[PDB]
Amino acid sequence: QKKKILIVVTHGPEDLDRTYAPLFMASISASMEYETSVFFMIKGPKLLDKKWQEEERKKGGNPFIHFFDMAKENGVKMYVCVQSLKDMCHMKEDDVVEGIELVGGSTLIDLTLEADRTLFF
Amino acid sequence: QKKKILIVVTHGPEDLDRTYAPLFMASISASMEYETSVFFMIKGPKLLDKKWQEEERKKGGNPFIHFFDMAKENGVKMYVCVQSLKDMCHMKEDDVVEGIELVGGSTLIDLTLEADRTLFF
Amino acid sequence: QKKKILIVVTHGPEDLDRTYAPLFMASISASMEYETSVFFMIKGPKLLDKKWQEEERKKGGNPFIHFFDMAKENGVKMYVCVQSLKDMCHMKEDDVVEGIELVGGSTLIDLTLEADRTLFF
Numbered sequence: 001q002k003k004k005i006l007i008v009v010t011h012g013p014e015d016l017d018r019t020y021a022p023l024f025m026a027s028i029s030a031s032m033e034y035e036t037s038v039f040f041m042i043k044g045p046k047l048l049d050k051k052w053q054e055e056e057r058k059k060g061g062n063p064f065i066h067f068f069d070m071a072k073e074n075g076v077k078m079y080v081c082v083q084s085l086k087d088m089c090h091m092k093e094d095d096v097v098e099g100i101e102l103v104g105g106s107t108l109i110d111l112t113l114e115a116d117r118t119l120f121f
Numbered sequence: 122q123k124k125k126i127l128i129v130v131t132h133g134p135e136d137l138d139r140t141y142a143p144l145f146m147a148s149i150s151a152s153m154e155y156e157t158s159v160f161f162m163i164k165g166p167k168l169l170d171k172k173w174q175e176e177e178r179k180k181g182g183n184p185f186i187h188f189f190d191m192a193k194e195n196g197v198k199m200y201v202c203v204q205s206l207k208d209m210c211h212m213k214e215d216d217v218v219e220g221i222e223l224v225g226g227s228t229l230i231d232l233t234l235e236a237d238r239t240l241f242f
Numbered sequence: 243q244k245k246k247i248l249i250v251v252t253h254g255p256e257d258l259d260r261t262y263a264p265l266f267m268a269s270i271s272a273s274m275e276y277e278t279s280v281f282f283m284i285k286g287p288k289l290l291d292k293k294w295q296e297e298e299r300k301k302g303g304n305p306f307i308h309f310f311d312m313a314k315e316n317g318v319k320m321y322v323c324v325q326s327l328k329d330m331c332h333m334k335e336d337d338v339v340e341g342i343e344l345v346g347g348s349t350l351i352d353l354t355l356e357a358d359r360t361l362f363f
C-alpha cells in the first residue's frame with residue numbers, strides 16, 4: 001500500500017518565505033512516490049487567488065508560483081478550506097484557481113487521519 | 122476505541138488570525154466525536170489571561186473568544202505549558218482562566234504520543 | 243524498541259521567541275529517553291551560523307544558545323536542509339556550526355516517516 005503525505009500551508013503572500021518550502025516539499029514527496037496532498041488554510045487561500053497568481057506569473061520570479069506548478073506537474077492533490085477562504089481571506093469560491101478542491105475544515109481532520117504523516121507550515 | 126486529536130496553539134493576541142482556526146478546528150474535531158485536546162504554548166498562554174479575556178468579552182467581536190467558548194461547550198480539554206506561561210509570557214499561574222490544566226512541557230510529548238494525530242499552529 | 247521524536251524548526255533569529263521552545267522541547271524529549279532529532283529549515287538555518295552563534299555566546303543571555311547547547315549535551319541529533327541553507331538563507335555550507343548533518347529536503351520526509359511523532363514550529 002502506497003504511503004500518504006499531507007502538507008498544511010497556513011501562510012499567504014504576507015509571508016511568502018513560508019510558502020515556498022511546503023510546496024517544494026510536496027514535489028519532493030511526490031517524486032519519492034508518496035501520494036501527496038496540500039491543504040491551504042488561514043492565509044494560505046490567498047496563494048490560490050486567480051488574479052494574484054496571474055499577476056505573479058506576468059511579473060515572473062515568484063518562487064511560490066514555480067513550486068506550485070512543479071507540485072501540480074508531479075500530481076500533488078490540493079485542497080482549500082472554505083471557511084478560511086471566505087471568512088479569513090474574504091475571497092469568493094470563484095476566486096480560487098482551477099483544480100483545487102473546496103472543502104470544509106472537517107476534511108482536514110479526515111485527511112490527517114488518512115495520511116501516514118502530516119507536515120505543518 | 123475512540124480516536125484522539127491534539128491541537129497545538131503557539132500564537133497569542135499578537136497574531137490573532139492564527140488563533141481562530143485552531144480553536145474552530147478543535148470544535149469541528151469534537152463534533153466528529155474525536156476526543157480533542159488543545160495545548161497552548163509559546164505565546165498561546167496570553168490567550169488564556171483572565172483580564173485579556175474579560176476585556177475582549179466586554180468589547181465583543183473577538184473570534185478567538187467565540188471559538189474558545191464553542192470548543193469548551195463541545196468538551197475540548199485544554200492544557201497550558203507552564204514554562205511558556207511564566208518564562209515567555211510573564212504570567213502568573215493565577216492569571217490563567219479556570220478549567221485549563223497547567224502542565225510542564227513533558228506533557229506535550231506524552232499528549233502527542235497518546236493522540237492519533239496532532240495539528241500544529 | 244526506543245521511540246523517536248522529530249522536531250522541526252522553521253524560524254531564525256528574526257523570530258527568536260519561536261526558536262527557544264523547540265530546542266527546550268528537544269532536551270525534554272531526550273531526558274525522557276526518546277531518540278530525539280531536530281530539523282532546521284526555512285529560516286532555521288540562520289540559527290546555525292557560526293558567526294551569529296559566536297556573537298551571541300560572547301554577548302551572553304541568548305536563550306536559544308542555552309537550549310541549543312542543552313539539547314546537544316542530551317544527545318539530540320541535528321539536521322539542516324541544504325536548500326533552505328543556501329537558497330533561503332544565503333549561507334554557505336561552511337557557515338554551519340559543526341556537528342549538524344547537512345541534508346536535502348527528501349530527508350525530512352524520511353525522518354518524519356521514521357519518527358513516531360513529529361512536532362512543527
Ligand SMILES: [Cl-]
Nearest residue numbers: 015136257260
Ligand atoms: Cl510566524
